[PDB]
Amino acid sequence: VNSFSGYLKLTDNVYIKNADIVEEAKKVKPTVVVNAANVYLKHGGGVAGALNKATNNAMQVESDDYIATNGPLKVGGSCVLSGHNLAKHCLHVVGPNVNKGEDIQLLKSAYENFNQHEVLLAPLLSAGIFGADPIHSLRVCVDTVRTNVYLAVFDKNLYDKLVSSFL
Numbered sequence: 662v663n664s665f666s667g668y669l670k671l672t673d674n675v676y677i678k679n680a681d682i683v684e685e686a687k688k689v690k691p692t693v694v695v696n697a698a699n700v701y702l703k704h705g706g707g708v709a710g711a712l713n714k715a716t717n718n719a720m721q722v723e724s725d726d727y728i729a730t731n732g733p734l735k736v737g738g739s740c741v742l743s744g745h746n747l748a749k750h751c752l753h754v755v756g757p758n759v760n761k762g763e764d765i766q767l768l769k770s771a772y773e774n775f776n777q778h779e780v781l782l783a784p785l786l787s788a789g790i791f792g793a794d795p796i797h798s799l800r801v802c803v804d805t806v807r808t809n810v811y812l813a814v815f816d817k818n819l820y821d822k823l824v825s826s827f828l
């Protein structure tokens with residue numbers, strides 16, 4: 662039993678809700694919140710900009726030190742950093758950004774990072790400003806993630822379409 666509330670169950674392990682991931686993280690304080698990161702951990706907009714803003718830019722400060730030490734992530738890769746005031750940990754995961762021309766096949770690799778964590782609060786990878794089809798991203802999530810994932814979909818219209826079109 663966990664503290665996530667109001668989710669619709671899609672499969673044995675995948676759950677979904679119309680929610681602002683920022684507000685959801687603040688309420689649940691999950692062990693892991695997933696960020697829709699880029700390789701430079703520059704948290705400018707989309708989910709990343711919103712999460713960082715909620716940390717009062719502490720996520721960005723920590724991220725800049727991470728990059729200065731380690732260099733950029735790989736597309737499809739991830740790193741674990743602090744969750745600040747939102748969660749114990751933040752798993753920064755880089756899905757491909759279609760608006761940069763990146764290979765959509767890397768979306769599966771991106772979701773594989775979730776399997777290293779038993780329970781996660783997450784957005785749909787590569788959706789929103791990353792330019793992928795959110796319906797496809799959900800299909801890849803369900804077919805790749807085996808651990809327990811609670812998906813937050815900000816857009817109510819999109820949430821309804823995701824549920825109504827789910828196979």
Ligand SMILES: CCc1c[nH]c2ncnc(NCC(C)(C)CC(F)(F)F)c12
Binds near residue numbers: 708
């Ligand atoms: C600023 C963005 C954002 C803040 N809080 C969030 N929580 C969840 N998902 C988010 N964005 C991903 C979507 C849901 C695919 C974006 C889209 F497609 F609907 F426009 C956000």
Ligand SMILES: [Cl-]
Binds near residue numbers: 707708788789790791
């Ligand atoms: Cl977005």
